[PDB]
Amino acid sequence: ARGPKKHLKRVAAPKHWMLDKLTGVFAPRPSTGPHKLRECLPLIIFLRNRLKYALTGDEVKKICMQRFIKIDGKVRTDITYPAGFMDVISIDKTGENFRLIYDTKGRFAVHRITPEEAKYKLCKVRKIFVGTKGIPHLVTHDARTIRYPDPLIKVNDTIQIDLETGKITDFIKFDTGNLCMVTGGANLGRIGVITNRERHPGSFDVVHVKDANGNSFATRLSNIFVIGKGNKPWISLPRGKGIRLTIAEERDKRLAAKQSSG
Amino acid sequence: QLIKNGKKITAFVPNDGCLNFIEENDEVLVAGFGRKGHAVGDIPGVRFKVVKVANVSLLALYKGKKERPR
Amino acid sequence: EKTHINIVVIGHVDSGKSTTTGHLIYKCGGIDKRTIEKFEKEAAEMGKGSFKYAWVLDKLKAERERGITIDISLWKFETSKYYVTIIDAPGHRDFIKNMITGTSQADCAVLIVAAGVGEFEAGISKNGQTREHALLAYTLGVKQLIVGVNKMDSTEPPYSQKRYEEIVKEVSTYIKKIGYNPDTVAFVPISGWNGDNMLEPSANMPWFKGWKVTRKDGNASGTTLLEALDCILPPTRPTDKPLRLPLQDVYKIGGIGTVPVGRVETGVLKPGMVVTFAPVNVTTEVKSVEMHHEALSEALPGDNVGFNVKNVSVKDVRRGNVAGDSKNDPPMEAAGFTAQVIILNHPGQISAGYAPVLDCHTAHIACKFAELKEKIDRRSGKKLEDGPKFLKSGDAAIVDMVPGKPMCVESFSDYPPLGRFAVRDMRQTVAVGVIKAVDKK
Amino acid sequence: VHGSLARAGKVRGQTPKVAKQEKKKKKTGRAKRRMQYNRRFVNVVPTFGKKKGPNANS
Amino acid sequence: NDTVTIRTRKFMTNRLLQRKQMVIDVLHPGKATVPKTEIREKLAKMYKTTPDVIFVFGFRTHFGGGKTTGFGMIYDSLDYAKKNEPKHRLARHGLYEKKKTSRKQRKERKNRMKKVRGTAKANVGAGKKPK
Amino acid sequence: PVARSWVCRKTYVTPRRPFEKSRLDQELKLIGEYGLRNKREVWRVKFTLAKIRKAARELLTLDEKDPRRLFEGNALLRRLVRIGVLDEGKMKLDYILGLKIEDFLERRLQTQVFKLGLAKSIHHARVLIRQRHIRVRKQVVNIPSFIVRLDSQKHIDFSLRSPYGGGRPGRVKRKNAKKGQGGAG
RNA sequence: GUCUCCGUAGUGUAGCGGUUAUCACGUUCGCCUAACACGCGAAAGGUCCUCGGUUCGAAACCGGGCGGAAACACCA
RNA sequence: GGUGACCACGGGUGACGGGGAAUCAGGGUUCGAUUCCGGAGAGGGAGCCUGAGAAACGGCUACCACAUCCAAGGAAGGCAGCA
RNA sequence: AAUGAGUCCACUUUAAAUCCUUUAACGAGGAUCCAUUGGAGGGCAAGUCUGGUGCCAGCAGCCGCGGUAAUUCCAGCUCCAA
Ligand SMILES: [Mg+2]
Ligand SMILES: [Mg+2]
Ligand SMILES: [Mg+2]
Ligand SMILES: [Mg+2]
Ligand SMILES: [Mg+2]
Ligand SMILES: [Mg+2]
Ligand SMILES: [Mg+2]
């Protein structure tokens, strides 16, 4: 190509978007933003396929342009704005708030939250550097950068960013024994406790995490988001508590649900 | 003589009275004669057979299902 | 809206046939002065400057270098009343087959004889072609025509009375003999090479006071060619009759493919239904239709149009084929046909097995007389006797013939523009007649 | 050429032309399968013949 | 009319488009597919509204007759219905007119107007002559 | 470019060698007994049984207690008992290999209506199903090869619009009635 | 469409305005063999591509049309 | 100096590469121009302006090959886009 | 007695249509509203039937058939395969 691409084929779209095949040839193609397009949920499919508030891209465009969609405390009129991980979606006209969190199957779930919980938001710091006049800076997992953080905050820690101010209220150090969530790879969406961290210089650090039920897995360091102090989460966990259960104990859960409902 | 590449071949005319449907300067379609460039049966050195003549099938002309283009 | 009329031009070799129509097309505004001067300069080198107006119709380079018309050709122009097109004739003993195609695709005609001494006498004679042309016009269906005498400028004295009268009376009595009405036909004196008496009355000759013409529809008075042709009879249109269309030619136009060209006789042709060509028996959807490089939504009868057809090649459809709608009755190949004929002149007797060439509309096919049924009196269709054994000139008979080559014909009782035919041999029209009964394959 | 093509189509020319008999239509599909199953699976013959074929020319 | 029944399901309301939308199924045991007009006022009686804000479409009938299923859309106000609803459904109810030329002709006019530069009267006269 | 799918597969496999008496006779016997149209719709059920047997053999090659083997074995046995070709108590991968295409052909709707007695013969059953007279639960089925599950076994019944359940007699019946009233006053 | 040439048994062609023949043949029949092979002798085979004209008469002299073999153009 | 019988280098390809497709005991043998990813090209080469991004061709310049109009002074082209 | 394949009203579909699914009214007794394509020596399921031809025409993937009594050509009838 002679320049950047601005189309996204329907079948080449990310799997977790859960887009079918027969509805179209193209995919939303999210605009550039705080999150990469591989792990973002554009508002068009969030409001058309996850909530069914809209039947068409035109209807979700009307909803967006009427300025009801507030993301992270700011109104976004972009139809294809990349929402991403744990950005608070706020609709004040219908009076509910959403937190965008992966489920046990590594897909963004429709997670409803109270306004007082929605007022804050967790972020994973991605780099800490000192800039001119000796001013410390902090770049989170979003594109959000802030000045003058707590000097105790190190790389790949978690910070509590209260909305409408953007400042830090609290933070969780990346330490052994802290509740985390996997934000990439096969274990995407699994909640557990940091148990071990082996570090390979010149390469990727591998962290071993054990969940509540005792199923211990591992993942790369860059795919980890600390979400709680020790074991109590600082956010509202979705249904299933991020406990991935295999198909063997999923099928009988389905059968028990059918028996109870029938 | 084939239209492409001008090569001259000999092609069998495969039924009882299908030679009379063939006159000079006809445009015939020729296919292989059965075994991949090898002669078949008692016909020496003949590896092709006529399927159509003047864009009408020899089978159609033999069964009388349609007529020569008069 | 405005009605379209086809006018053909018949005459002799070097009779001003193309010169006067070049003047006419320039003066009415078909071409421009720059183009006609370009024709003059092109004629200047090889000295055929007398035919710089003839080259408007003589589009062929062989036509230009030989000074004679080989094939018929078409032009369009708009008069003050309606829309007309014009076809030239070759005007030669050899190209009778070429000119009869144009005269067949005709609603009306004009006949040209040079007024000079030494040309009119050869023009109207046994070897003359004016007789043949006027005969074949009525034979093929030219109901009304006009006559314009040309090149009286070369007469001595130029533009005279008695020279005009001695020839208009001769042609009037000849067309009275053949069937035409001298009262109906208008007589126009024109000086072609000088370009006189087309738009305004030329004051060099005041002895001509204008013609008065009478006809069953009405009466008219004329002083110029335009005034003559602005009062012609509008022919009827067999729109209700199913589509029939002889094909004057077939072209391979770059970018659009095979376009047959012919004059719509019966029915209305519009892009959007399948048609069938009779002699070749091919079925094809029409893609577009067009007259004079201008698109038409419908092709009314009497329209000389080129129509574009799909998924066929130029070799499949040739000259003389007739097309018709497949949804209506499709025209198709005829094994034989019965005709009421009138033999005109033949040095010998006509018997069974005689194979002259029958020229019907656009097709020109040799037909072999299968047998003779009966002889017919010249008038009233009177039965004379059964099973003739020989035929002579000035006699009428019922003859059944089969064309050697495949040919589609129509009975005159059904398709009058297709039932007319002529018979040609030894460069004279041996027989003329119509078709009565046709069998189908 | 040796000149032996003139005999082309000789026998197909000399063959006398006998017309096809006009006969009743044959059932097709499931009915045909039913008929030919009934003919050769449900029938009893007391005659000898050592299981003679279906197109026996008796 | 004697035996025709509307049933609603997957009912929900969204203030974002100021409407209530659902998927409906109507049972016509021995009759053809019930006309959208008839569903309109029948559902209007069902929801105590008027049969001019009611919007239904997508009615496909199950094999063997009987049930047919479509998507029902009702608004709080006709101005909102005019505002956020497709023009083809508005034209189906007659509230919108699509009296306009062909796409081919529109492209022809655009390309011809490209040939005329700047000049207002010639740019507007570009499509006047070749109709 | 296009938004089609073109995901398709054949449902049958032709036999390896044609013109063998044993196979021809056995296939014709099944066709005649089950009222099948052609050899293709017995090759189809043969192919389905072949796929089932191949999956079962592949699962049996896996080690016992292997979770993939357990999960897919229970799923396959559940589907087999749902279609009813297998007994509910015979929940073993071994018993899948003991199945025959007669078990699958017996579960067709065409055979099911004949066994229930809604038709006087298997061919009468096939034509009755094709002419929209038989319904399952509430949906009418005009497919003879409709595999009948055990729960849908009891709900097979005449169609309500057919001239065997509700009213509305046939076109020839109504023509005969109008001829009767036109001939006899 | 125009122009140039050719068209006699089935192929190879003699031929005269007053006779279209043969030849290598091709075919058939006798001629020897179970079948052949070789070999001997006879017959058929023509609207002279077709149609007409000139002539007392034409295949041939001419006018066409047809088919084949060459060329030139022909763009609603 | 560097590379080569562990096949360099050269040549051929009826070679765009891959995900994949056919066949099907197991192992394999053929096919993948073709809707997804990546590359290349816009008649053949070549050189550029603009712009963040082009050696762009539904941008320009030149040559070659085809080819349109012309009042013969000039002018205008690029369907391996949809038809 | 039962149905469609067709005609065909309306609904439905759809940007607008079309098609499908609904549903009126016609619509089957050679139900002529007509199933074909290849074969019948063997391989390989199916005829030592009848009539022509007579090493000719032709068939035949391979063995092979045909020279006057052809299970193999050309046809009729009858069978076989899908
Ligand atoms: Mg290549
Ligand atoms: Mg590829
Ligand atoms: Mg690509
Ligand atoms: Mg490029
Ligand atoms: Mg820019
Ligand atoms: Mg370039
Ligand atoms: Mg036989």
From Swiss-Prot, chain B:
It is linked to Brachycephaly, trichomegaly, and developmental delay: An autosomal dominant developmental disorder characterized by brachycephaly, ciliary trichomegaly, dysmorphic features of the face and hands, hearing loss, and developmental delay with short stature. Intellectual disability and autism spectrum disorder may be present in some patients. Component of the 40S small ribosomal subunit. Part of the small subunit (SSU) processome, composed of more than 70 proteins and the RNA chaperone small nucleolar RNA (snoRNA) U3. GO terms for cellular component: cytoplasm; cytosol; cytosolic ribosome; cytosolic small ribosomal subunit; endoplasmic reticulum; membrane; nucleolus; nucleoplasm. Keywords: Acetylation, Cytoplasm, Deafness, Disease variant, Dwarfism, Endoplasmic reticulum, Hydroxylation, Isopeptide bond, Nucleus, Ribonucleoprotein, Ribosomal protein, Ubl conjugation. This is Small ribosomal subunit protein uS12. Belongs to the universal ribosomal protein uS12 family. The keyword Transport does not apply. The chain holds residues 73 to 142 of 143 of the full protein. GO terms for molecular function: RNA binding; structural constituent of ribosome. It comes from Homo sapiens (Human). It is found in: Cytoplasm, Cytosol; Cytoplasm; Rough endoplasmic reticulum; Nucleus, Nucleolus. GO terms for biological process: cytoplasmic translation; maintenance of translational fidelity; ribosomal small subunit biogenesis; stress granule assembly; translation. The modification N6-acetyllysine is found at K63.
Curated annotation (Swiss-Prot), chain C:
Changing K315R: Abolishes methylation by EEF1AKMT2. Keywords: Acetylation, Cell membrane, Cytoplasm, Elongation factor, GTP-binding, Host-virus interaction, Hydrolase, Isopeptide bond, Membrane, Methylation, Nucleotide-binding, Nucleus, Phosphoprotein, Protein biosynthesis, Transcription, Transcription regulation, Ubl conjugation. It catalyses: GTP + H2O = GDP + phosphate + H(+). Residues 11-18 are annotated as: G1. GO terms for molecular function: GTP binding; GTPase activity; kinase activator activity; kinase binding; molecular adaptor activity; protein kinase binding; RNA binding; translation elongation factor activity. Gene3D superfamilies: P-loop containing nucleotide triphosphate hydrolases, Translation factors. There is a cross-link at K382 (Glycyl lysine isopeptide (Lys-Gly) (interchain with G-Cter in ubiquitin)). GO terms for cellular component: cortical actin cytoskeleton; cytoplasm; cytoplasmic side of lysosomal membrane; cytosol; cytosolic ribosome; eukaryotic translation elongation factor 1 complex; extracellular exosome; extracellular region. The modification N6-methyllysine is found at K33, K162. The modification Phosphothreonine is found at T429. Residues 67-71 are annotated as: G2. Residues 88-91 are annotated as: G3. The modification Phosphoserine is found at S297. The modification N6,N6-dimethyllysine is found at K33, K52, K162. It is found in: Cytoplasm; Nucleus; Nucleus, Nucleolus; Cell membrane. The keyword Nucleotide-binding applies. Residues 191-193 are annotated as: G5. The modification 5-glutamyl glycerylphosphorylethanolamine is found at E298, E371. Belongs to the TRAFAC class translation factor GTPase superfamily. Classic translation factor GTPase family. EF-Tu/EF-1A subfamily. This is Elongation factor 1-alpha 1.
UniProtKB/Swiss-Prot annotation, chain E:
The keyword Hydrolase does not apply. One of its GO terms (molecular function) is RNA binding. PANTHER family: 40S RIBOSOMAL PROTEIN S24 (PTHR10496). It is found in: Cytoplasm; Nucleus, Nucleolus. Residues 100-118 have a biased composition (Basic residues). InterPro entries: eRP_eS24_sf (IPR053709), Ribosomal_eS24 (IPR001976), Ribosomal_eS24_CS (IPR018098), Ribosomal_uL23/eL15/eS24_sf (IPR012678). This is Small ribosomal subunit protein eS24. Pfam families: Ribosomal_S24e (PF01282). The gene is RPS24. Its main location: cytoplasm. It is linked to Diamond-Blackfan anemia 3: A form of Diamond-Blackfan anemia, a congenital non-regenerative hypoplastic anemia that usually presents early in infancy. Diamond-Blackfan anemia is characterized by a moderate to severe macrocytic anemia, erythroblastopenia, and an increased risk of developing leukemia. 30 to 40% of Diamond-Blackfan anemia patients present with short stature and congenital anomalies, the most frequent being craniofacial (Pierre-Robin syndrome and cleft palate), thumb and urogenital anomalies. There is a cross-link at K36 (Glycyl lysine isopeptide (Lys-Gly) (interchain with G-Cter in SUMO2)). Gene3D superfamilies: 3.30.70.3370. Belongs to the eukaryotic ribosomal protein eS24 family. It comes from the Eukaryota.
Curated annotation (Swiss-Prot), chain F:
Residues 107-181 form the S4 RNA-binding domain. Its main location: cytoplasm. GO terms for molecular function: RNA binding; rRNA binding; structural constituent of ribosome; translation regulator activity. Residues 161-185 are annotated as: Disordered. Pfam families: Ribosomal_S4, S4. Keywords: Acetylation, Cytoplasm, Isopeptide bond, Nucleus, Phosphoprotein, Ribonucleoprotein, Ribosomal protein, RNA-binding, rRNA-binding, Ubl conjugation. There is a cross-link at K92, K138 (Glycyl lysine isopeptide (Lys-Gly) (interchain with G-Cter in SUMO2)). It comes from the Eukaryota. The modification N6-acetyllysine is found at K65, K115, K154. The modification Phosphoserine is found at S152, S162. Component of the small ribosomal subunit. The ribosome is a large ribonucleoprotein complex responsible for the synthesis of proteins in the cell. Part of the small subunit (SSU) processome, first precursor of the small eukaryotic ribosomal subunit. During the assembly of the SSU processome in the nucleolus, many ribosome biogenesis factors, an RNA chaperone and ribosomal proteins associate with the nascent pre-rRNA and work in concert to generate RNA folding, modifications, rearrangements and cleavage as well as targeted degradation of pre-ribosomal RNA by the RNA exosome. Belongs to the universal ribosomal protein uS4 family. This is Small ribosomal subunit protein uS4. It comes from Homo sapiens (Human).
